[PDB]
């Protein structure tokens, strides 16, 4: 019945959306770091072979 209550719940749903976007950005950052380290390791082994 109270409008303030519904307005308070809108902040809850926008915080849930912000949480989901932060989660996908963190997953992308960790995949980027894994590929970066794999390429760096292959590059170092190739420099020693050269």
């Amino acid at each position: 019945v109270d409008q303030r209550t519904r307005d308070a719940l809108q902040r809850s749903v926008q915080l849930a959306i912000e949480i989901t976007t932060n989660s996908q950005e963190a997953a992308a950052k960790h995949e980027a770091q894994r590929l970066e380290q794999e390429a760096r390791g292959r590059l170092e082994r190739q420099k020693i072979l050269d």
Binding site: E44, R45, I48
Partner: protein, 50 residues
């Protein structure tokens, strides 16, 4: 780092061989030049003595 050390072992073996070659070549060259000069001086000293 484990894979890089696996190849770095063979790199260090080849560098050990190259250092061996360089050091023994330098020492052999200098010693043989001094021995040749000494032999020529010795035969000259024989002829001077006569």
């Amino acid at each position: 780092q484990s894979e890089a050390e696996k190849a770095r072992k063979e790199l260090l073996e080849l560098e050990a061989l190259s250092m061996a070659v360089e050091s023994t070549g330098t020492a052999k060259a200098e010693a043989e030049s001094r021995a040749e000069a000494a032999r020529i001086e010795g035969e000259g000293s024989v002829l001077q003595a006569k």
